[PDB]
Structure 1
Amino acid sequence: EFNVVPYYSWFSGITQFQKGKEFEFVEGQGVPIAPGVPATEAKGYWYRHNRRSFKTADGNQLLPRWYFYYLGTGPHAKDQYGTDIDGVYWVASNQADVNTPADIVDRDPSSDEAIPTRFPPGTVLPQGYYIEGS
């Protein structure tokens, strides 16, 4: 959850469940599927949301959840594709030109719900992460 309204992602998140497992995709992979989006526009980044949990008197544990943003949108809309940034993982179809922003409008209000994150057959899924909505 967010105490500052976030940029809304078109897709559900990917939640870490095993610590020590790295968030990664094979180059050319990792752009979630949206109906009718052309492969030339399939370019962007996953953004890590670090979560925090209040102290109790039990065991006293919350793992990061990542959200996808098309290139030129979201909290890292101005950063160059492939630039080394903590918490940002760039992904793009081999059909995409990562020099130009995706021609994709942002999501919300009550106009559209988040698309459950899906990847095409052949996609190497990052071990230790759970895809929300799966």
Structure 2
Amino acid sequence: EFNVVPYYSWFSGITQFQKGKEFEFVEGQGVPIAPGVPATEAKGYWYRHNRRSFKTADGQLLPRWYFYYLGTGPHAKDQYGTDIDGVYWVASNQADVNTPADIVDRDPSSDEAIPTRFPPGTVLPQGYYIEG
């Protein structure tokens, strides 16, 4: 969970389940589908949430990534494509990444997270489980 309230993603997360596997998409891919959003607005980034478990006397919790439209979320002011640890930038070939997406953030319980799905043809990152 989060002990500091997060910026809320419109979408469900993508959880790592195999070590060493890289979170990636093919250029032009990796923007989750939201009804009615034009392709020109399909631009943003996945943000890594590093998770931490507590110590037991048993025997580790891998990161989960969340999507934010460009100009929103915890890296709202960073430039598209810039090398930042824990930020993976994605955009439709139709999007102009110089301009923020004109896309209101989500919440209250005015709207729940949209289950993450990608269009046919999307190369899915092996070793990751899409929540939902």
Aligned-pair Cα RMSD in Å: 0.2
Counterpart CA distance in 1 for 2:35 and 2:110 is 16
Deviation at 1:110? 1.2
Encode CA deviations 1:80-99: one digit per residue, 9 max, x unaligned. 00000000000000000000
Classify the secondary structure of the residue corresponding to 1:114: coil
Consecutive unaligned residues of structure 1, counting only runs of 5 or more, are none
Q: Partners of 2:77 and 2:19 in 1: how far apart?
A: 30
CA-to-aligned-CA distance 1:39-58 (integer Å, 9 cap, x gap): 00000000000000000000
Taking structure 1 as the reference length, the TM-score comes to 0.98
Q: Deviation above 3 Å: which 4+ runs of structure 1?
A: none
1:52-84 Cα distance to aligned partner (Å, 9 max, x none)? 00000001x100000000000000000000000
Give the match's secondary structure for 1:90. strand
- Partner residue, 1:76: 75
SS in 1 for 2:84: coil
Matches of 1:34 and 1:116, distance apart in 2: 9
Give the structure 1 partner of residue 3 of structure 2. Answer: 3
- Supply the distance in 1 between the matched residues of 2:21 and 2:44 (Cα, whole angstroms): 22
Q: Which secondary structure state, in structure 2, belongs to the residue aligned with residue 130 of structure 1? A: strand
Task: Provide the identity percentage.
Answer: 100
Query: Secondary structure of 1:96's match?
Result: coil
